[PDB]
Amino acid sequence: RTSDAGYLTRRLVEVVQHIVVRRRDCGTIRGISVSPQNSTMPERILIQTLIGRVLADDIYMGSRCIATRNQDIGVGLVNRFITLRTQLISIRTPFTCRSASWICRLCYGRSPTHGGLVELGEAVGIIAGQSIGEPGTQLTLRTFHTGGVFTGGTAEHVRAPSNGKIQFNEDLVHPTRTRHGHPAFLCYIDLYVTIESDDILHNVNIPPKSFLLVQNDQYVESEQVIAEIRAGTSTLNFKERVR
Amino acid sequence: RAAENDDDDDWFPLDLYEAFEEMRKRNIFDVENMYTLADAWGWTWE
Amino acid sequence: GSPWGFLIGAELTIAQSRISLVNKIQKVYRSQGVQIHNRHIEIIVRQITSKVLVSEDGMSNVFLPGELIGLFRAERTGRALEEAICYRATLLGITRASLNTQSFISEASFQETARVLAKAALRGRIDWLKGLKENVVLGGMIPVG
Amino acid sequence: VSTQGWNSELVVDYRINEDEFHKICLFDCDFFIRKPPDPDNDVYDFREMYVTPPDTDVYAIPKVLAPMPDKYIRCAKTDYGWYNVTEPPIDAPRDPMYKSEREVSKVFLTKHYRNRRLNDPEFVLDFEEIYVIDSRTKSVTRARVLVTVPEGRNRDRKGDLLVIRDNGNSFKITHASKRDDPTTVIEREEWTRTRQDMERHLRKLRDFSISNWI
Amino acid sequence: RANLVFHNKAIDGTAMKRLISRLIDHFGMAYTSHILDQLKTLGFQQ
Amino acid sequence: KDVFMEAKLERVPFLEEQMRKVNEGGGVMAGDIDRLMKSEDNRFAFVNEIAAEATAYVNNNRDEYGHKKAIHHVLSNRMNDAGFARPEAYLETEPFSPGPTYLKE
Amino acid sequence: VWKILQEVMQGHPVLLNRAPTLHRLGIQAFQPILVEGRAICLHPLVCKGFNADFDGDQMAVHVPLSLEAQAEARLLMFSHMNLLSPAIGDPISVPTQDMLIGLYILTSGNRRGICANRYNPWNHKTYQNERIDDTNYKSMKEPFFCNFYDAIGAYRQKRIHLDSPLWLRWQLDQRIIASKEAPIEVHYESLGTYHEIYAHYLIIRSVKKEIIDIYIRTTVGHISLYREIEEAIQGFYQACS
Amino acid sequence: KSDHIKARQEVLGTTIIGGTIPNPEDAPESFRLLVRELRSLALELNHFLVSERNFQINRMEA
Amino acid sequence: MNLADPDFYKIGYVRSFRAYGVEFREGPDGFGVFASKDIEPLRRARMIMEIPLELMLTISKRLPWMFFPDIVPVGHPIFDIINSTDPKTDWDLRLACLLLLAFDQEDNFWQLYGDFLPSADECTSLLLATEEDLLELQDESLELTMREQQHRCLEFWEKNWHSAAPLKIKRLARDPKIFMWAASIAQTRCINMEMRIGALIQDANVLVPYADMLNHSFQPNCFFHWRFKDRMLEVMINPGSRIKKGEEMTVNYLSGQQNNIFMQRFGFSSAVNPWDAICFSGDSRIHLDTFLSVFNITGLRQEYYYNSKSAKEGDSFVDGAVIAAARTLPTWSDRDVPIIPSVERKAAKELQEQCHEILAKYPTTAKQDQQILDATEDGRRTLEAAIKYRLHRKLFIGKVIDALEIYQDRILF
């Protein structure tokens, strides 16, 4: 996994090695415009996409203009956008430059290494290739601490609050057979299974499409699965077929 | 041949929608950049 | 019409390809807790989608069909000329986009050295020494920093 | 526009000069009480009050939840603030690394003992009557202070320590000798609030019923 | 007397990274280099 | 009127030991380079200008450099025209050394 | 000979390069000094910049000869103007494992609740109770140090431990990150005293003037860290004129 | 510090004695070898230095 | 020449303002910036008066209006006043609004810096003068312009402070004489510069505390520079200029434009005015390459020099008046290589005597004469200043006549 990462770095740099910041504003008016109030991007991917970029068109609030053309987006300026509910922000990205053999200072944005406009004659093509090649080995380094056990999906389980006596209405649930081969109870509505824990009356919330694994008036221990929450299977995305 | 997560995220329809503004404010139908193609020199002259 | 129409179509196709590719690249890294700004992704993505391929029945006299001229190269002349320009699209890979470079020296030192050198010699290609690999090969000063 | 109720903030379309009122700055409101002339700004003629959003000219009488005085009472102005210290973003060099602003949420007004003077050698606060100005819901209420002193009604007013508590609700008066130390009060709530968490954490163990030791 | 924040909690790994970023943006990369040398010495001592 | 006049201006004492470790660690030069570059637009042009000035310094008065590190000389010259004493060529001495060489940790 | 090879190296940068180069910060310029032994001593903070451990690794040195090259090495590849990674703009030299543990232990605080007292402090007793306040007055409470340096001095005498709480007078504005909060208990004497007790600080206001009684409950570790940062800044500022 | 036949000797000379190190003009011997075995395959590789002030070709010899 | 109060340097010093070799004085005048110690000639520039961006107002010079030290809150009903202001004509109005706002918002730096600013009884700007004081001025075009300029601000006072006046907008100017103080301050202490904040190069009218105290002199020794990275305004000592131990350090206000009718409008009055003269006409022409030759004045109108290495101290009669009237007069040149005809009947004497007739010892109106100078009555800080302007115009005309007759006398050595 370290050789393939090294090979990808060679190819990433090869495409962009001649890309150098050769000039200031190249005289473009087309700017990629983003909509932060679509509520689609979380305020951690949206924020990381606007910081450093330079604006393409003035941003207004009716009569008041809060950010003009040729004004890079800082840290506190983004907070001024989502709070004020601005729906259109146009920025200058590498996609909007008027050339393919080089790039502009304003069509690139803030330099990520020294907190300012990118300086003339910077090998931004080399920087882009390396920064998307190095990480490639965390897809390895992050795997260089384990073997046989990985990170994937799980399922949801409900455990008893404490020792007690499960009580509920057995009439509203419909008999079933669990994927482990045990009898259980599908509930299609919100039940309220109560546990008489001597002095306490813990109420357990069971959402629909659950798999109650306990009967009425059954003694349960402290921590022990009494009802599945939702669905089942091998706790992952899509189906296969194995013998 | 591929896990079709699909999960349509930022796609757009296969119709004539968004004529004047093609994709947000991307490409307005100019009708001023290219009459001069026939006005500055001869195209409309014939 | 035909001159307007495919200018519109190619520009739309390139835009959609860029939007899809940026998100597709960034999702793999964001699913593993890796943070990289979109500048580095977009710089590569632009080079991946920046050139059109002159489709068949587009002979004319300037662009022979099968040529792989740039996007601006085609859209600036389509606004001026009136033949069958008739390009469609190329989402060139990270390997193929580097073989169609302005400098044959850089390509010759990457892959398929014999083919690149043979074609350049037969054509009589000229390298203007504007990149960074070619100037390193010749021992000359690189034009950066 | 008398001292009536009950839960209606009736609006007023007339601008009223505030150079004869009392400027009581709060978080989400701005209560106004008339200020009769006096040498040292120590009279509060309640009668007419008006509450407005912070720094706004639109006036409206507040909500009265208890009887208010109909005479001239010399009282003192208090506050209940938090001093939010949120840390703002840094844009340029030398930008501030922290913020600070008071968040006054309750303005208690304690009457003087029979409306004495500020400098006379008989200064005692009359803790029996205290009026609470809320900010979350614009309203004025009279406090319900409690006295645990064995002297009761007949006592020396030259020192009867008053204790306020959670969110400006509890009110007690205690002899000034038995004042709690700063550390004891802090340690008291820490002990109580963390003994519940420890008991809550240990409740899930199978042996919680048969246990001991806290 | 500088412009700093008096910490009163546990400065874990993610808090140290945040603090360095804020000291860099407020003072620069020339003042921060000396802070890092001092914090390294104080961290090793305790 | 604003009562913070001296609370924000009280001199921090015990700073004498946090004045020296800057001077042998190269901290003064590092904190002077950025102040010289605080007004420059392109850092590469500044570096090239410094290199050319140092080359001229080596050419005009050859038989002095080899110890003085003429780049340090030009940096000190540029820093010495606006106060900022900055001893010549940032030369370091050994005030207490009845010996040839320090151990250097 | 060594007097010469201690005299021509002062001011001549050298490029250190880690043999398995991975990222842009794998090659960095440095100001060498002569050490005794056979191994190159490297700064620990830049190690993660080199991704270098110390289980046995090799580093190649290079010497720039040209005056222009020396200017490049000194003014463009020194680890004091390359403190941010070009990926997203995050710090590349931050206190790693050992320094991080030291700073965490320093800023760990006291024992908050039941871990500091065996019995409840409600416990109506130990009041020195009688009809008058004339009894034995120990009131150990916590120390009331004037400022930082008093606290460090009292810590040097082993009078108090690192996590032993103390009261420190505050002569500045509000710095500790607070929130909506609530004052737990605000005592009010018949005379204007405004004794307020918050979650972690105490304010003694009045009805006349001079709201200067701000007291902070803290430990010597936080004081030490704040003093370290503050004096580092005020020493770098005055060292560089 | 590599291929230059004539430049290693001159840096040794200007470094024994002291002067301003001059930037080289000719390409290293690696490029000379490259043009040599690209000549063995019946192919050319010619450098040029078209001047910006006279447009006069200044073809280097290799 | 006593130094200022210690509070002057502080309050701003606590907010990162550093002055190295200067010390502002307190004596009754514009506070003034005078140096200490000696600097000796240098190479490029010595930086001084480190002034950060946070202590400014810097309204933009073109639409849209932006204030980088953000003073106006979001939705505050004073941006509507500014956005309704006519651009490109009255930049001193919105600036006055910003200055008034930076007096009642919070503990802003300008809330404290207001005390050191001149008050209504102080200041010399004509916008604070009265009717008969404006009449006391030997000028009618300037009188008309200043009478109109005292209006156009009464008008832009009742359009936004008329009996509705939200208390935010009110309490900033309760009467139309403190708004005049703010307008005069904006006129006197505004400077138009270029500010590179981030990726934005913009032109803006700005107000700079601790820098407006730099007095004026048409022979300057100070530059204004804007450090791009850390956003700081700095004064710079000129290269190759020796500095004494307490003498004046000055930065010019206007250059390449003068005539003493706009500089006087912007404060006080001209003293030497090296770019002003009175149209002569009335005669045919005078020679060009002799007025600058008798005094060894260098040509090249945009840059006129005296060449102090002239002679054995030939005269002490060079001033701004000489260098101004050496280029604003007939000055026939013809082929520029003539015989230099010493025809005193035409090339000299009577022709400038005709100028002596044209300048017939103040023949226009002569409302007053030598009696006016040093009337020994100081008052109101605006009277005796129009009198000062009259004195200085009369002195300029008299010294121009004197220089002309010295020139016409010395054409033969």
Swiss-Prot record, chain E:
Coiled coil: none annotated. It is found in: Plastid, Chloroplast. In plastids the minimal PEP RNA polymerase catalytic core is composed of four subunits: alpha, beta, beta', and beta''. When a (nuclear-encoded) sigma factor is associated with the core the holoenzyme is formed, which can initiate transcription. DNA-dependent RNA polymerase catalyzes the transcription of DNA into RNA using the four ribonucleoside triphosphates as substrates. Belongs to the RNA polymerase beta' chain family. RpoC2 subfamily. This is DNA-directed RNA polymerase subunit beta''. It comes from Spinacia oleracea. The lineage of its organism: Eukaryota, Viridiplantae, Streptophyta, Embryophyta, Tracheophyta. The gene is rpoC2. The chain holds residues 8 to 53 of 1361 of the full protein.
UniProtKB/Swiss-Prot annotation, chain G:
Mg(2+) binds at residues 53, 55, 57. It is found in: Plastid, Chloroplast. DNA-dependent RNA polymerase catalyzes the transcription of DNA into RNA using the four ribonucleoside triphosphates as substrates. Belongs to the RNA polymerase beta' chain family. RpoC1 subfamily. In plastids the minimal PEP RNA polymerase catalytic core is composed of four subunits: alpha, beta, beta', and beta''. When a (nuclear-encoded) sigma factor is associated with the core the holoenzyme is formed, which can initiate transcription. This is DNA-directed RNA polymerase subunit beta'. It comes from Spinacia oleracea (Spinach).
From Swiss-Prot, chain H:
It is found in: Plastid, Chloroplast. This is DNA-directed RNA polymerase subunit beta. In plastids the minimal PEP RNA polymerase catalytic core is composed of four subunits: alpha, beta, beta', and beta''. When a (nuclear-encoded) sigma factor is associated with the core the holoenzyme is formed, which can initiate transcription. DNA-dependent RNA polymerase catalyzes the transcription of DNA into RNA using the four ribonucleoside triphosphates as substrates. The chain holds residues 1009 to 1070 of 1070 of the full protein. Belongs to the RNA polymerase beta chain family.
